[PDB]
Amino acid sequence: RRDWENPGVTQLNRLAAHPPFASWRNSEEARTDRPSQQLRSLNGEWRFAWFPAPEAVPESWLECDLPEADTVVVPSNWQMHGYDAPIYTNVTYPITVNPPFVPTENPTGCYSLTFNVDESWLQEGQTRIIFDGVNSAFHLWCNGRWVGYGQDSRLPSEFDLSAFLRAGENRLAVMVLRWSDGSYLEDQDMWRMSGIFRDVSLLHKPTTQISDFHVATRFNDDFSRAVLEAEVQMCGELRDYLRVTVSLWQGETQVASGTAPFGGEIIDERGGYADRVTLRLNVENPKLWSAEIPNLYRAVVELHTADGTLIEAEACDVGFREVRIENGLLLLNGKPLLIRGVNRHEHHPLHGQVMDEQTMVQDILLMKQNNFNAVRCSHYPNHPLWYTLCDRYGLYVVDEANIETHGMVPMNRLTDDPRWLPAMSERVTRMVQRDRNHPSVIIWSLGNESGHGANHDALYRWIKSVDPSRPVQYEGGGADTTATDIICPMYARVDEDQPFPAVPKWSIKKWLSLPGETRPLILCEYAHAMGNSLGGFAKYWQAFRQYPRLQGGFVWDWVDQSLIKYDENGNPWSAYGGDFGDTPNDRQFCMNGLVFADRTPHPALTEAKHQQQFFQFRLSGQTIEVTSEYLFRHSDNELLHWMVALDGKPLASGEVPLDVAPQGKQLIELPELPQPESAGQLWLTVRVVQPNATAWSEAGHISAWQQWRLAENLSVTLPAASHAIPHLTTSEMDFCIELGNKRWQFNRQSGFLSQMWIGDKKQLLTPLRDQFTRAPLDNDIGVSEATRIDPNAWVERWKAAGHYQAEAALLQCTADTLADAVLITTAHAWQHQGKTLFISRKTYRIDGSGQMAITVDVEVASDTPHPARIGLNCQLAQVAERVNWLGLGPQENYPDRLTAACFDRWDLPLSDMYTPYVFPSENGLRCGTRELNYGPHQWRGDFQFNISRYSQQQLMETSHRHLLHAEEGTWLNIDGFHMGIGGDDSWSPSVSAEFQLSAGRYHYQLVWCQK
Amino acid sequence: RRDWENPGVTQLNRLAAHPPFASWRNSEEARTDRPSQQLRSLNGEWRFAWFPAPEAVPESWLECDLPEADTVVVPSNWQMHGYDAPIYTNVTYPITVNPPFVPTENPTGCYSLTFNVDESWLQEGQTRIIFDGVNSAFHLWCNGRWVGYGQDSRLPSEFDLSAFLRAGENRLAVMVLRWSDGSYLEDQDMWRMSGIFRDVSLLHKPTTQISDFHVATRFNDDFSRAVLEAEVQMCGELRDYLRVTVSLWQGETQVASGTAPFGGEIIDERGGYADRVTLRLNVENPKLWSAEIPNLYRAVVELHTADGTLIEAEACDVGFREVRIENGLLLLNGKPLLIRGVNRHEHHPLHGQVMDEQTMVQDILLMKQNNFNAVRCSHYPNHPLWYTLCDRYGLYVVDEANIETHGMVPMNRLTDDPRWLPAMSERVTRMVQRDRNHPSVIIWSLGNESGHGANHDALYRWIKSVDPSRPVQYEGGGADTTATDIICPMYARVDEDQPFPAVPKWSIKKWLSLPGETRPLILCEYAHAMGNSLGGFAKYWQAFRQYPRLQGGFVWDWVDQSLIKYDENGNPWSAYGGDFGDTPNDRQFCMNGLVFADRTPHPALTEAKHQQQFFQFRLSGQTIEVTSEYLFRHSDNELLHWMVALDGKPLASGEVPLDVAPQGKQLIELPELPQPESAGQLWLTVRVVQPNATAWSEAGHISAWQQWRLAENLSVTLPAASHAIPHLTTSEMDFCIELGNKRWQFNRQSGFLSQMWIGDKKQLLTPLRDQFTRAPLDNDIGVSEATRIDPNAWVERWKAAGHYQAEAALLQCTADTLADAVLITTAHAWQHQGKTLFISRKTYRIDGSGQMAITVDVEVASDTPHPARIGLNCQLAQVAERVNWLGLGPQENYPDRLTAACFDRWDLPLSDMYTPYVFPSENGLRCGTRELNYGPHQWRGDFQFNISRYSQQQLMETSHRHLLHAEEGTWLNIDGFHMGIGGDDSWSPSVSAEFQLSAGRYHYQLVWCQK
């Protein structure tokens, strides 16, 4: 029999799902969550062998381990050890589509563990083994005797070893298969790997047990009285002296308690359950749970006797909150939620898909510090410690079933087939049976990207039947199906519509206004941050804040899924799909996160932080309206620090303590602000600072900020008459301008500034030319490769029009001396295959004071695709350690993503000016720049600059950041106009028309001097 | 592995469910439903062995059959052959309740078949084997090689034998187990048996196949234009030249056709199914299908090539009807249905649960002739020929899934467990996949008596998701759960409420009026006809006709489930639970049908026929309002025959042709009716006669009848002065009265009429005494046995009060001669343990003309339970061949069940006066009797008489009808007052207060003479 090739068999001799059990024998040890000695961890050094097929495994492995097998640590994935190549694929299945049959070449991992069991465990009670996760299917042997079979990969599999274990030395043998019929339900967009990637534990229970318990909370309209209903299910012999005690604790203080004997209410004509008992505990003025204030209680269920002798104890964490939907609005504790969620994949920086507590805690801290209040367990149930840490730290959790058949054509082939109805149920129901006691979990999810079938509807309303306390959602079928209470499309745009046949993604504002539609909209996936991305996030959050039924969404996604490889010298470097020999692969589409693999923040994280602030600011006159977006907490750990700056020079500042009610308004009256008579723009900047240290933040954390323009003083002063005039000399090929120390040289053949001299030091390695092309971004490329070309992609439209190939032709290059200046007029045109795309007309005025003023007028054809860039390009010959600039910063910003950057004077190291994206592209641009100082050079005007050690040509050719080599000198790109980056999705043109260079005529002025 | 003890494994290598396939290779052979040679019947002589356990089966059976094995016919049940004892149980499981484990003693039947397969079948195509039903689980071997495993019992199991079959001699070996884990879902109230009880077939298909097809009909508001949507699914290689033709035929006339290549509409983001194709055929003025006019079309689906070469053809029957629910009303074709349904168990008279076409046709004819328009497939899917015969003959079908866990405590133990969610789905989904193309099936059913769980809800709304064309219902959980569109309680009463805890059965009129309730009410089970039963049916149908949302119900049930045993002389006799050694058993609760096991009608069938007439009559003045209850047919084969009778003597009659629109009204004006001056009551009787022969009825069938009282002539004449006076002689112990030939003798010790003499022939074997007790009915006993006594049962209240034990005490017995008569006054009292229950005072007047007038006054105590009877009892010494009576008849009727019997003069054989109920009880009563003639004796008055050869004492002692022996003479019971029989249920007191003898004082007069 081949159980891995049959969807009707998903388990053999596997125990029922339940909430996590520690099997305490002391109620005080359960209350404080002390470790239980009845639970043993089998994590550690296991013996491992690899085989190309399960049939190649010798049967002598069932008796003793092979001498040729290696020692590995469990949990791990054997693709991170050299036994296989991890396979990255987005939509296409990594195997031949032929359900439910897998290829004969099925990689097999044979794990073995030799251990000992105490004799007290064997005399009484039941001993079970728990596998928290095995990818994908596995067969279990205990002492050479077959125990059972498991198929699911993200839910624990539990087997009874009481009749298998022996005193002394015991050997457990697990045969794990890479591919199974369940892998057809596991088409998630991640790295496909395999192995025992989660914890292995051994649990000992008494003869009579606490088999299950369900804890629910019911409230009134005011949330001042609460009823905790705890229903307890036992296994074993029914005895009249058996009693249960349900105790609720806040810290060390008992709040409520209840003791009843076994026996339930009459339900049917035959009676009720004799092995179940329900307890109703009344709580007066409970402390409600939320993402703002995570108030937690400890619920201890003690199965004992009438004498008071404790048999067993099970403890859990209970949060008094109630999540429901009324009037098309999702309410938690009676208040409409605004979801600031993010999609999270379980990707360890070093160990692949093996998750520990440290990475969970770090990820939670960076999400909470960046104003994220929710998280999506995508696309599978997570590690049960993740949920507990979410309850402790206060994050909303959307628990999603491990179902995805994105590679099926059509996508609902398996979900409409009743033959796959059992197996899918085993991936849904058990999940609920594991996670219905966590208050962090507020929304159940059927899965992702599986079309719409009747199995989805059946499992959906099954969850509605068993657990009415949580709303449940599903994307497939167009996000309007009967299988969702919450509208959750992926990558739907704010204003424009994209009507695909029979699954149209209408705009969210239009979607809410459709005839007969009532449900709230929370985006399951939006704002694809794949590389240099996340443009239009301000539009998304403006729509969220303006519309009551637009309640936020989940950003895709948190962390890049890149794997560490090593070069010839052993230096580590991040790698993506296709770097391990896996073919076919979706090349860099595994990196969509807001942080790097080592949890280094991207510049997009600052924009996400600014757009998700819980404090909104409105400057009117000289007063500030501060509006809270907290729903349950008072502003008790926040103060407003304001400052006024004249062109980056501070003038006045102050600190005001914030006292704002939840979703309330506060007025702050600033003192008499300075009124300078010096030229420049006055900027008012406010920041919200937390003085005390929270469990997730440190003392002085900035949670919100805002900037406005105050009164402006335009400069009307005139420069003094420079005593020296520039000498202009005309050669047969060059124009040479002297000002004593400073010498400019223009080449009359190319028409560009050939060379600059200060003393005898050359300053330009390449001439100052025009640039209308950038290194293509991940949003620009989309899903277009060399083999398959997408004509809608921006990079393909640019290279089809010859933007990367067009050659500059010199139309005019004249020079003439003025009274106190030398005037250089140039005029070029860029042509491709006889078609003129761009025409540049520049005027260089060299004054006697030393400044060189460049006026640039660019004509762009309307029929050619809109250029990504209009500016200048040169390579300086000097590498300076510091870069100074008066402008927006200090992070990377773009025309469609700049609301987070503040206008000030920023000084940064040169290496900080380059964003180390794994896939090289355009990066490091700083918008709104009024002044730029680098070495001896100073540039003034209004421009967007990026300064780096890598040319745009090198950034275009190179596919990995570790292959980049620093070039001689420093590459500078000053641009009059720059095009937005997009970010609605990464397979369609996402740049809005307001951020496209579509005017046709552009003008910009620069001043180049030596400070 | 023990697959029969694991709910996660319900099949192994079993093919998907589909509508029935014949695999035609000629479209004309498919259109006419000619037999297909690609389908072979394996029914016939198989080799069979019996084993106490599957482990006791030798493996040599896998190679060749055992020499000790017998030859049986397939299909059959081996409990009908002596290998096992069939077990009857109602609620208690026949095995130890320990799911999913069955006892080690599991009876095993090993079937073997040796056959041959043509070599043309092996060269090309796929050969499969179909088991239409195997009870319960089975393992299959072909030529000694294991093929698969099946678990379901009422749905076909199909296995692929293409890679197993060989040229020449092939052997198939089936191991069938009596008990499995699926038997926990098979707790239906029937005879538990086992074996291959349905057909076994072998089907041959090509390489490319028609795997499935779904046919649906969509209408407009008028039902004049129809769209037939036929969706076709194929298996095999996808070729561009493959085409499908969907042809619709009415007789030999093609109505519509459509041809399209394979390829469907775009459904998801990945596209659509390339192996599916949908055809939309427009039909102009279709002939709608209903139970009144079953208009059928033949739909032929031909998979062929572009050249026109036919590959394969599949044909089905299509009825254009649309069943929906609006405004809380169930509409078929826009008209509100009034269900006249009945519950049917598949019980063959001789072969147990093996159903053939003859029994189906006969059952359908008796249902349609008795005004039944619907049937419930309870509690399991039926034989696929049953549905086809229902479409041909026009019966509505409620298809019910094979799920019932009535023995679980609580009843929803398995249906709330997600672990049983897969298996239950395999019993639901596949059923739909077999029966969604039959227009006879109008209502889907999840099952019966399983409580309410989340699995019921999930499967319910799964059926809603796949098949919206039919409403779907479920009883469990109190019949108000979210798992029903149609309210279907069992045995809910018309007016009185019975509030069980958490599952109350409120009265239907009150149920419809509950706050927030909207759905229509159709009773799934009502009017329990267990033996002498079905009282209050008139109340049920009055409630159905008065209330628009009360749309009828299903009577439980059609046929008695009794098995034929043989005595010492080989004479067959019907037997019930406990007659085969099965213990525990529910003794005669298997016989609840309206017909006997040999399809002999019970007297209750006449009442069912009269209460379900499609014609209602209202007499006003001398005109008759005839109202049709047909919804789709015109009265084209009906005429009204009226007659007027004076005390059973016909006077005038006539025949009027009926011309009534559907649910219309017609006035019939009778001619000048006779006006007799003779004494007596005039009765007007109307009958609806069908002159022509329908497919289900014969020429002259009576479908409805009604009777009214016309003007009455009270008798004021005086009897003549008799010349002779009776001589009265007083003895020391007797009173003797002479009238020449006729001599009466009263015993002065007992006070009763001791003897009657005509000539020298004695006429009484026992004296004429009072009787206040009857042989207890099945409704009177209820669920009370000798071991467990139910105090609420009527028989236990009667025997606890001493009604069957009370002794008559003589208070007064006097005699005195009158002028022309002799007057005998008697007065008794019945006492038990010093408590007087009844007091009888009789007056016997013996006139000189010959008549003996008896006036009886009975006083009944109020605190004692109300007697079932108040009348006289005697045993005549003469057995006459004929019984004549002027009164209601000619069938058995009772005070609460008499609306079907007509008042006339009926002459019947004596053997016809005894109803042969299998469990003996009170029977043969005739109500409203004005005159009774038997031998030389004549009785006049108003009384209820039953005349038989068996005493009430013998009917009480004896438990089987074959043990009854005819006594000397003839037992006669003339009763002044009789108590109703009940029939709302058979476990509670169902007799209404208006039919109980609760007045306290009663009076009746009789006249005894010699005609």
Helices B357-369 and B384-393: crossing angle in degrees, nearest 10, is 40
C-alpha to C-alpha distance for B281 and B288, rounded to whole angstroms: 16
3-state secondary structure labels for all residues of B757-811: EECCEECEEEEEEEECCCCCCHHHHCCCCCCCCCCCCHHHHHHHCCCCCCEEEEE
Q: Are the beta carbons of B502 and A265 separated by less than 8 Å?
A: yes
- Candidates A15, A235, A268, A412: best to mutate against B (most CBs of B within 10 A) is A268
Fill in the amino acid letter for B823.
L
C-alpha to C-alpha distance for B551 and A231, rounded to whole angstroms: 41
Instruction: Give the list of residues 6+ apart from residue B871 with CB closer than 8 angstroms, or none.
Output: B770, B771, B943, B944, B973, B974, B975, B976, B977, B978, B1004
Q: Are the beta carbons of A421 and B418 separated by less than 8 Å?
A: no
C-alpha to C-alpha distance for B773 and B952, rounded to whole angstroms: 9
C-alpha to C-alpha distance for A879 and A910, rounded to whole angstroms: 9
Find, among B356, B430, B536, B532, the residue nearest to B153 by Cα.
B430
Are B470 and B399 in contact, with CB atoms under 8 Å apart? Answer: no
Residue B123 has, within 13 A of its CA and on its CB side, a CA count of: 3
Nearest by CB to B411, which of A270, A410, A454? A270
Instruction: Give the list of residues 6+ apart from residue A382 with CB closer than 8 angstroms, or none.
Output: A154, A346, A355, A399
Q: Do you find a cis peptide bond into B916, omega within 30 degrees of 0?
A: no
Q: Known binder of ligand: residue A527?
A: yes
Tokens of A578: 């296709």
Q: What is the resolution of this structure in A?
A: 2.9
Instruction: Give the list of residues 6+ apart from residue A642 with CB closer than 8 angstroms, or none.
Output: A624, A653, A654, A655, A656, A668, A670, A684, A685, A686, A687
> How distant is the Cα of B244 from the closest Cα of chain A, in angstroms?
21
In this structure, the number of other CB atoms found within 10 A of the CB of residue A241 comes to: 11
What is the number of residues in chain A? Answer: 1011
C-alpha to C-alpha distance for A913 and A907, rounded to whole angstroms: 10
Give B433's contacts in chain A (Cβ within 8 Å).
418
C-alpha to C-alpha distance for B157 and A588, rounded to whole angstroms: 49
Residue in chain B nearest A263 by alpha carbon: B410
C-alpha to C-alpha distance for A127 and A144, rounded to whole angstroms: 18
Burial A926-955 (b: 16+ CB within 10 A, else e): bbbbbbbbbbebbbbbebbbbbbbbbbebb
Give A429's contacts in chain B (Cβ within 8 Å).
418, 421
Let me know if B962 is exposed, middle or buried by CB neighbors in 10 A (0-12, 13-18, 19+): middle
C-alpha to C-alpha distance for A541 and A338, rounded to whole angstroms: 10
Is beta strand B339-344 parallel, antiparallel or unpaired with respect to B374-377?
A: parallel
Q: Known binder of ligand: residue A101?
A: no
CA angle B814, B816, B817 (to 5 degrees): 160
Are A527 and A565 in contact, with CB atoms under 8 Å apart? Answer: no
Question: What is the torsion angle, in degrees rounded to the nearest 10, for the CA atoms of residue A718, residue A719, residue A724 and residue A725?
Answer: -60
Q: Are the beta carbons of A269 and B500 separated by less than 8 Å?
A: yes
Find, among A481, A480, A484, the residue nearest to A472 by Cα.
A484
In this structure, the number of other CB atoms found within 10 A of the CB of residue B812 comes to: 10
Task: Specify the 3-state DSSP secondary structure of A467.
Answer: coil
Task: Specify the 3-state DSSP secondary structure of B608.
Answer: helix
In this structure, the number of other CB atoms found within 10 A of the CB of residue A907 comes to: 12
Let me know if A726 is exposed, middle or buried by CB neighbors in 10 A (0-12, 13-18, 19+): buried
Give B262's contacts in chain A (Cβ within 8 Å).
none
Give B408's contacts in chain A (Cβ within 8 Å).
270
Is beta strand A70-74 parallel, antiparallel or unpaired with respect to A145-150?
A: unpaired
Residue in chain A nearest B428 by alpha carbon: A418
Burial A885-905 (b: 16+ CB within 10 A, else e): bbbbbbbbbbbbbbbbbbbbb
CA B354 → CA A763, B79, B198, B348, B521, distances in Å? Answer: 102, 12, 6, 6, 33
Q: Known binder of ligand: residue A452?
A: no
- Candidates B269, B404, B450: best to mutate against A (most CBs of A within 10 A) is B269
Are A424 and A376 in contact, with CB atoms under 8 Å apart? Answer: no
DSSP state of A26: -
Active site residues of B: 449, 525
What is the number of residues in chain B? Answer: 1011
Q: Known binder of ligand: residue B90?
A: yes
CA angle A964, A965, A966 (to 5 degrees): 125
Fill in the amino acid letter for B936.
P
> How distant is the Cα of A506 from the closest Cα of chain B, in angstroms?
14
Give A422's contacts in chain B (Cβ within 8 Å).
421-422, 425-426
Tokens of B323: 């069943």
In this structure, the number of other CB atoms found within 10 A of the CB of residue A383 comes to: 21
> How distant is the Cα of B624 from the closest Cα of chain A, in angstroms?
48
Task: Specify the 3-state DSSP secondary structure of B840.
Answer: strand
Tokens of A124: 């009484």
CA A584 vs. chain centroid, Å, equals: 25
Nearest by CB to A269, which of B9, B10, B503? B503
Pinpoint the alpha helices (H) of A335-493: 357-369, 384-393, 421-435, 454-466
Tokens of B660: 């009534």
Are B198 and B383 in contact, with CB atoms under 8 Å apart? Answer: yes
Burial B350-376 (b: 16+ CB within 10 A, else e): ebbbbbeeebbeebbbbbbbbbbbbbb
Are A587 and A91 in contact, with CB atoms under 8 Å apart? Answer: no
Instruction: Give the list of residues 6+ apart from residue B877 with CB closer than 8 angstroms, or none.
Output: B761, B762, B763, B764, B765, B968, B969
- Candidates B15, B268, B457: best to mutate against A (most CBs of A within 10 A) is B268
C-alpha to C-alpha distance for A897 and A652, rounded to whole angstroms: 29
Nearest by CB to A466, which of B10, B454, B476? B454
Are B336 and B668 in contact, with CB atoms under 8 Å apart? Answer: no
C-alpha to C-alpha distance for A981 and A944, rounded to whole angstroms: 14
Cα dihedral sign, B243-B249-B253-B255: negative
CA A765 → CA A64, A560, A769, B693, distances in Å? Answer: 69, 37, 12, 110
Are B737 and B743 in contact, with CB atoms under 8 Å apart? Answer: yes
Cα dihedral sign, A907-A911-A916-A921: positive
C-alpha to C-alpha distance for A539 and A520, rounded to whole angstroms: 19
Are A299 and A247 in contact, with CB atoms under 8 Å apart? Answer: yes
Instruction: Give the list of residues 6+ apart from residue A634 with CB closer than 8 angstroms, or none.
Output: A659, A660, A661, A662
Fill in the amino acid letter for B857.
D
Residue in chain A nearest B147 by alpha carbon: A1
Task: Specify the 3-state DSSP secondary structure of A241.
Answer: coil
Helices A421-435 and A384-393: crossing angle in degrees, nearest 10, is 40
CA A892 → CA A82, A880, A994, B595, distances in Å? Answer: 38, 20, 20, 89
C-alpha to C-alpha distance for B368 and B693, rounded to whole angstroms: 13
In this structure, the number of other CB atoms found within 10 A of the CB of residue B559 comes to: 25
C-alpha to C-alpha distance for B526 and B541, rounded to whole angstroms: 11
CA B629 vs. chain centroid, Å, equals: 22
Sheet of A157-160: strand order equals: A39-41, A200-205, A126-131, A157-160
3-state helix, strand, coil in chain A (%, to 5): 15, 40, 45
Tokens of B674: 């006779």
Q: Are the beta carbons of A462 and B455 separated by less than 8 Å?
A: yes
- What DSSP element (H or E) covers A28? helix A27-31
Establish whether A449 is a catalytic residue: yes
CA A624 vs. chain centroid, Å, equals: 33
| DSSP symbols for B467-535 | -TTS-EE--TTTS-STT-SSB--BS--SS--B--TTS-B--HHHHHTSTT--S-EEEEEES---SS--T
Are B435 and B387 in contact, with CB atoms under 8 Å apart? Answer: yes
Name the maximum alpha-carbon separation found in chain A: 113
Residue ranges with strand state E in B818-901: 821-832, 835-847, 852-860, 869-876, 882-889
Sheet of B665-669: strand order equals: B615-620, B623-628, B665-669
C-alpha to C-alpha distance for A720 and A818, rounded to whole angstroms: 16
Find, among B702, B697, B688, B537, the residue nearest to B617 by Cα.
B688
Q: Are the beta carbons of A12 and B12 separated by less than 8 Å?
A: no
Q: Which of A312, A525, A922, A931 is catalytic?
A: A525
Find, among B117, B113, B86, B123, the residue nearest to B174 by Cα.
B113
C-alpha to C-alpha distance for A950 and A922, rounded to whole angstroms: 10
Burial A196-226 (b: 16+ CB within 10 A, else e): bbbbbbbbbbbebbbbbbbbbbebeeebeeb
Q: Are the beta carbons of A271 and B419 separated by less than 8 Å?
A: no
DSSP state of A288: B
**End-to-end alpha-carbon separation of chain A, Å?**
82
Are A749 and A928 in contact, with CB atoms under 8 Å apart? Answer: no
C-alpha to C-alpha distance for A642 and A299, rounded to whole angstroms: 46
Are A541 and A494 in contact, with CB atoms under 8 Å apart? Answer: no
Residue A32 has, within 13 A of its CA and on its CB side, a CA count of: 7
CA angle A769, A770, A775 (to 5 degrees): 110
C-alpha to C-alpha distance for A62 and A585, rounded to whole angstroms: 37
> How distant is the Cα of A430 from the closest Cα of chain B, in angstroms?
8
- What DSSP element (H or E) covers A957? helix A952-957
Task: Specify the 3-state DSSP secondary structure of A935.
Answer: coil
Residue owning tokens 């189906």 = B360
Are A151 and A12 in contact, with CB atoms under 8 Å apart? Answer: no
Residue ranges with strand state E in B548-664: 550-555, 563-566, 572-575, 615-620, 623-628, 639-646, 649-657
Cα dihedral sign, B468-B474-B480-B483: negative
List phi, psi (to 5°) of B563.
-110, 145
Instruction: Give the list of residues 6+ apart from residue A163 with CB closer than 8 angstroms, or none.
Output: none
C-alpha to C-alpha distance for A745 and A755, rounded to whole angstroms: 5
- Candidates A6, A97, A211, A269: best to mutate against B (most CBs of B within 10 A) is A269
DSSP state of B995: G
- What DSSP element (H or E) covers B456? helix B454-466
C-alpha to C-alpha distance for A630 and A637, rounded to whole angstroms: 13
Give B273's contacts in chain A (Cβ within 8 Å).
410, 413
Q: Are the beta carbons of A465 and B458 separated by less than 8 Å?
A: yes
Residue owning tokens 């209602």 = B616
Residue A287 has, within 13 A of its CA and on its CB side, a CA count of: 15
Residue in chain A nearest B269 by alpha carbon: A503
Instruction: Give the list of residues 6+ apart from residue A570 with CB closer than 8 angstroms, or none.
Output: none
Task: Specify the 3-state DSSP secondary structure of A424.
Answer: helix
Tokens of A267: 């339900």
Distinct helix (H) and strand (E) counts, chain A: 12, 56
Are B410 and B339 in contact, with CB atoms under 8 Å apart? Answer: no
Instruction: Give the list of residues 6+ apart from residue A514 with CB closer than 8 angstroms, or none.
Output: A506
| DSSP symbols for B241-252 | TEEEEEEEEETT
Cα dihedral sign, B620-B622-B628-B634: negative
| DSSP symbols for B292-322 | SSB--EEEEEEEEETT--EEEEEEEEE-B--
Are B941 and B1004 in contact, with CB atoms under 8 Å apart? Answer: yes
CA B101 → CA A313, B96, B425, B631, distances in Å? Answer: 30, 9, 20, 52
Give B1's contacts in chain A (Cβ within 8 Å).
12
Tokens of A351: 């160990």
Nearest by CB to A425, which of B270, B273, B422? B422
